[PDB]
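Ticket #1213: bound-state structure for adenosine-5'-diphosphate.
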Amino acid sequence: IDLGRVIGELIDHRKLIISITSVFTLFAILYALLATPIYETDALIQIEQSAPETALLQSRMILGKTIDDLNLQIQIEQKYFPVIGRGLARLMGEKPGNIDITRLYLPDSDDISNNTPSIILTVKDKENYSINSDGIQLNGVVGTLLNEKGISLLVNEIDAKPGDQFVITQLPRLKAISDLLKSFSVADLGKDTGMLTLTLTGDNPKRISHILDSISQNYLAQNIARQAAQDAKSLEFLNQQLPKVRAELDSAEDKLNAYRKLNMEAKSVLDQIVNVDNQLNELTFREAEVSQLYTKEHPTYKALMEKRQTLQEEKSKLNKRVSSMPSTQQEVLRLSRDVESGRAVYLQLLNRQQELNIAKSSAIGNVRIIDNAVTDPNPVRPKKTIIIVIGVVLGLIVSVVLVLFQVFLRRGIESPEQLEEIGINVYASIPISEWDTLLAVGNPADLAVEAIRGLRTSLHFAMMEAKNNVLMISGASPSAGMTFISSNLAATIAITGKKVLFIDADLRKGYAHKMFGHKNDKGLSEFLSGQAAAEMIIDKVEGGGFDYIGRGQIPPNPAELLMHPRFEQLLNWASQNYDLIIIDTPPILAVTDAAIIGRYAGTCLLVARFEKNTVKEIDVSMKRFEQSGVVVKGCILNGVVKKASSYYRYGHYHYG
Amino acid sequence: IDLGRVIGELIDHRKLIISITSVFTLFAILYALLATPIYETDALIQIEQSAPETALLQSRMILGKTIDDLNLQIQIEQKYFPVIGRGLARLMGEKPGNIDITRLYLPDSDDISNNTPSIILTVKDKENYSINSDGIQLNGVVGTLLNEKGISLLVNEIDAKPGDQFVITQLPRLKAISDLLKSFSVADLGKDTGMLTLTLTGDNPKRISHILDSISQNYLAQNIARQAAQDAKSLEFLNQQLPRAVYLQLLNRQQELNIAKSSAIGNVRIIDNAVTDPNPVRPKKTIIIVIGVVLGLIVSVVLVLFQVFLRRGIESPEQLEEIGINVYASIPISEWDTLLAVGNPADLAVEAIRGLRTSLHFAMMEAKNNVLMISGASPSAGMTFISSNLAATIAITGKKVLFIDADLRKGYAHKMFGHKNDKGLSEFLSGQAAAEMIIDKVEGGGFDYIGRGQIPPNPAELLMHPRFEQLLNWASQNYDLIIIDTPPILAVTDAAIIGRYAGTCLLVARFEKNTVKEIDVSMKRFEQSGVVVKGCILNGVVKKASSYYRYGHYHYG
Ligand SMILES: Nc1ncnc2c1ncn2[C@@H]1O[C@H](COP(=O)(O)OP(=O)(O)O)[C@@H](O)[C@H]1O
Ligand SMILES: Nc1ncnc2c1ncn2[C@@H]1O[C@H](COP(=O)(O)OP(=O)(O)O)[C@@H](O)[C@H]1O
Ligand SMILES: [Mg+2]
Ligand SMILES: [Mg+2]
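RESOLUTION: The complex was predicted; output attached.
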């Protein structure tokens, strides 16, 4: 191949190329403009090693401590119904809403799969709101806590417009730890120094900085505990307190065994209290530790008793509910409470004993925060430019390969050279006429009619020394242009003052009578079957100037009629009253009518359609005519259009 | 391919090559002369390690301290409307202005995007100025501080000419830290030495040196505070432990801790305070210009090679003669509504046409009659030009010539000869005229002609009338030569109808427009209609250095 071919093919398929590339680039643009941006924050820590510190920072202990501090197990998502509502809302300048939640406890359905309970909160105003878990509508108010139907909720400072909806999920603690750990990274950045670089990525530019600050504070507090833990009495306090609790736990277990040897509400309110007790105990430890390493007027410490206030209020409401259930199940719950309270505290103290050991045996005495966490205002993802470039390049690659397949899979004719290589004379090339009437009469100045005049002058020289004045037009496949060519050629030969007869011998799908204006009675069939004479079948074209014979009524045995000798009698009679006779026939590959007629025709031409037919089809038609004893003079290419890749140039342009 | 061909192609396209390369080089010059210069300053620090000190130097605490000290959060820009105003103003040697601002507070609009409040200050004199936020015009004066509409401002020492405008931005502290960081670099250069090279690049040759000095001072004063502290912690502990030999022992230890606190010089030492290299490091003008010139050359050469491989027109008669087509002449462009063979009888094109005339005088013997038909493949190839001038030159030799304009669709011969447009060829063929009212005399010629007449609606069908052959037979007895001009053969079929009665037929191929394919198709289409084409005439030739086919198209006399 050569570059001229490929350039021509590209120019010809430019519309497809442009469409595909535009679609791919549009998809890339929309993706890069709708993807939620991802911000990144960092901090710098000074270590007085650093590999065990790297391992310890990403441990479940410290991250879990941070989550318990910041209530990261409460997931809040602004609701947009489509997969693109969020992006457009950001683009429209709409301010994303947020709600501050300080207490959430769902009834914890805890089925086989959905371990994460979730509810939907709809904003009604700046004060009240609606809540639905499974369609059950409840109304709540900012400020006052809600304790209904095994659902505990505390909403503060709703910042949104009315009508907004938010999904509230209570995801499990380990899930929150895993989510935090996925997006959190630690590095040394020097491979030897006491410098640690902490990095965190997330979609909220403020939340991630707060989280990273909390992580740094927790780690520093853990190491600063080391220096003060050796002389601390908490070690001896825990060493003595733990055996006492275990006996209480064991005694609680033993009592529970004696009473044993399932009310839904009673079980739920039991879970209500146990959750409250857990938060109260851990907060009590947290308040102690914060009071030691921080001050009371610190906002963190101010947060502590406020949450402690809420927990006591929730417990008070729970006990009032417990006061309302019958004592029969109350005894079971009180036994159930103590066992779980014992287990929870025993678990809590075991960590406390473990954590206190963690402080003491720490080789790195001094840990310093050089740079507190800040967030880079430029999002790190998505990287818009690379996405757009990849989209454009992908569009170009797929367009080019698609064009190469379409080029390599075409087999139709493209230029008369393909036919002339085989040894077939092409007598004309007719272009597509963009214009049920004769073209050679409606628009005599059309390009196609000019090409047909060229064909007329070719024939006037070819059809000399022919055995008679009968010309047959046929073709390989239907809808190639046989009737079009034949009728228009008849018109153009008629306008020069010669008597022309057009015979529509397509006894299967002929419609020439429609295109000429007709008296459909007494066509060719009626003559061939013997029930008409030769004079009632000939009609005059109105806008033409030549006579015609229509097919007539469709017979059931077309090919058998054409073999009757009356057909040759008709041709011999007509050949003395007309200067030219043009016969239209069905395709030769489909049926055999053309080969029957061709015995009586002095000249025979095939019509090959430009892009549809193949060289093989035309060769096969040539040979099939040969076998039946019909000599084909040549071919006529029809329906040509301008192709830049052709590099073969017709005169199909207006001159006048 | 060979070297001669490519050299010729470059010689021929030299105009395009020079134009493209010069444009690229001009843009390179403009960029290298208008880009804002960037200066670079450096300093050298000695470390008494060196891996964590790099990270501590680029920390937000030290850079933030520097920014707070030198107020890097007040950004001042001289205003030039275009992306080239600053560069041009520098080129005329105009001194940029500067303003000292020591206190600034904007209302902090802080919308979703524009977190950076800004104002525009227009200097009116050495003392007063106008301030606009969003059209809110205020007047301020150097010295007195301003607090109006939630804007606090203090300007000192305006150094500019009146009428200048300055954009004043109060960017957030973190943005200033990031901006400082991106232009600040630290390297070790020894991988073990206590040597650190600090580098800072910026547009102001003095401001960057001040900033780097401030950074070094902050880092150094921070470092000694670390060593002094651990001594100070030890000194504080000993003082707090004071309750007589032990009493003197602690006092002596206290003095040792006092002297160790004051003798601060420690791990960090400033070898070289920052200085600025006066030659800007960017833009690197020479490499920019070299890249521009090379890019121009490469794109020009690729464009020329592209055009060469996509060229398809005829270039020399050898291309036609390979196929087996006799080329009887080659006519060049005549750079000179009149017959060329009369206006400028000594033109080069008329010389080539005389060569064609002598070729014909030998080709047209043994022709069945004395009729010559000139046709072509595509329109505006030169058929009318060639036919008319050939008639003129053959007429000046004393032979009777008849010129027929059988282009019944767009023939304009009557215009070019001076006309009585009535009774053309159409009127004769349709039967509404006789053979004698149609023949007209050319004034500056010497031959008769027949114009087309009125454009008919059925040109090709008229030409089939036997009256046309009657006219030719009659005229062939009263003239020595008959020339017939015809429409192209690819467009319409008129030429192939006419060619039945012509003894000789020639094609005209236009030099670069037509290709060999059209000429071959035209020959074959003439053959199918029973018309034998004698040969071809190449028209419109111009000099190509790449040709290596070389004509007699030069003056001799
Ligand atoms: N060059 C052409 N320009 C415009 N229409 C054409 C051309 N060739 C064929 N056609 C139209 O396409 C249709 C199929 O051609 P037709 O000859 O009637 O069928 P068939 O070849 O099977 O006998 C017809 O409507 C015809 O008018
Ligand atoms: N070698 C030439 N030098 C100068 N002008 C030419 C030359 N060949 C053709 N032309 C001019 O360019 C125009 C196109 O030629 P023309 O013969 O009129 O078209 P056509 O061949 O279709 O009849 C004409 O105006 C002609 O005078
Ligand atoms: Mg048909
Ligand atoms: Mg002309």
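RESOLUTION NOTES: Chain B is about 40% helix and 25% strand.
TICKET STATUS: resolved
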